[PDB]
Design a protein around this ligand. Structure first.
Ligand SMILES: CCNC(=O)c1cc2c(-c3cc(OCCN4CCCC4)c(Cl)cc3Cl)nc(N)nc2s1
Length: 208
């Protein structure tokens, strides 16, 4: 049962911009997603203070970076709060609707794309390097879901039947032909040291 949705006009406009604008400093994508992870880990650590049993889905609060040369993917996995189907489909794209506004006038004479995260729409930066992005997520307690988009105006949501994941979010970047550099170990280690030095959770870089 694959459902297909339209992006809100504004999000679509943002995605085309991210995909068409000439901009050489693409590496910022990793800071945005690692930071989205950080927030998601914060959220669950906070809520589990008044409700110890929300950790029943997983005690470890961490972030994994997993490169795969053969499939040509970089996956950022966290065990944070996850999203429900209503996050994925409505709630995230309604909030994104106005961060996209502000961010988009700042771009017209002045701000630059590297500032995208200040407007809470950092996730879309993944399109600097990915031709296709797939988000797998599990929130206590809804089912686990797979969101997917190659931009172009539309996205899909289906329930997921891949490997179960406790609780958490996986972002899988299917990188474009010319961005395989972000599958390189020293390359990942260089970007993380430089832009993500201080996250409050262990980050493990998987090797191939
Ligand atoms: C309470 C419901 N859970 C979430 O909002 C989550 C959103 C994310 C996100 C996330 C956050 C995102 O936006 C962050 C900015 N916001 C400020 C408040 C809500 C959205 C977007 Cl556009 C896309 C994604 Cl996939 N990433 C990751 N790794 N984990 C979670 S958990």
């Amino acid at each position: 049962e694959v459902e297909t949705f339209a992006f809100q006009a504004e999000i679509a406009q943002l995605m085309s911009l991210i995909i068409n604008t000439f901009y050489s400093n693409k590496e910022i994508f990793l800071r945005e997603l690692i930071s989205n992870s950080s927030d998601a880990l914060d959220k669950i650590r906070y809520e589990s203070l008044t409700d110890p049993s929300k950790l029943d889905s997983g005690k470890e609060l961490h972030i994994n970076l997993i490169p795969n040369k053969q499939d040509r993917t970089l996956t950022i996995v966290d065990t944070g709060i996850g999203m429900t189907k209503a996050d994925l489909i409505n709630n995230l794209g309604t909030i994104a609707k106005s961060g996209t506004k502000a961010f988009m006038e700042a771009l017209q004479a002045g701000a630059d794309i590297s500032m995208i995260g200040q407007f809470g729409v950092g996730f879309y930066s993944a399109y600097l390097v990915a031709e296709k992005v797939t988000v797998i997520t599990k929130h206590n307690d809804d089912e686990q879901y797979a969101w997917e988009s190659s931009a172009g105006g539309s996205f899909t949501v289906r329930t997921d039947t891949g490997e179960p994941m406790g609780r958490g979010t996986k972002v899988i970047l299917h990188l474009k032909e010319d961005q395989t550099e972000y599958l390189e170990e020293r390359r990942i280690k260089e970007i993380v040291k430089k832009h993500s030095q201080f996250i409050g959770y262990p980050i493990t870089l998987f090797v191939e």
